[PDB]
Amino acid sequence: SITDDFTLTSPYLGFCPYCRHSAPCFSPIKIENVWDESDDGSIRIQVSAQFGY
Amino acid sequence: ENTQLSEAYVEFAPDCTIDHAVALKVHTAALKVGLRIVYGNTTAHLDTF
């Protein structure tokens, strides 16, 4: 069963290939996936942070 | 003396229920036709193979 209880969930730290200083660094907003299959120009981005909670 | 085990496999992308291809093997075809036979003063619509 798929849960929407984010109290059981925690954000993490990723390894980004390009931080603000143009260097690899551990980031709290690391991008894991990007999906562009929409015909109107929207993209789905996965991030090590949790939005809306 | 530290060992790292790297794994990688392949899954179906989440958007594949819409963007996917189906590979089919299609055998001999069959023709089914719709006719509008008109005899005398009566018109009929029929589907025959």
Swiss-Prot record, chain B:
N-glycosylated. Interacts with spike glycoprotein E2. The precursor of protein E3/E2 and E1 form a heterodimer shortly after synthesis. Processing of the precursor of protein E3/E2 into E2 and E3 results in a heterodimer of the spike glycoproteins E2 and E1. Spike at virion surface are constituted of three E2-E1 heterodimers. After target cell attachment and endocytosis, E1 change conformation to form homotrimers. Interacts with 6K protein. This is Spike glycoprotein E1. It is a single-pass type I membrane protein. Class II viral fusion protein. Fusion activity is inactive as long as E1 is bound to E2 in mature virion. After virus attachment to target cell receptor PCDH10 and endocytosis, acidification of the endosome induce dissociation of E1/E2 heterodimer and concomitant trimerization of the E1 subunits. This E1 trimer is fusion active, and promotes release of viral nucleocapsid in cytoplasm after endosome and viral membrane fusion. Efficient fusion requires the presence of cholesterol and sphingolipid in the target membrane. It comes from Western equine encephalitis virus. Glycans are attached at residue 41. It is found in: Virion membrane; Host cell membrane. The chain holds residues 896 to 944 of 1236 of the full protein.
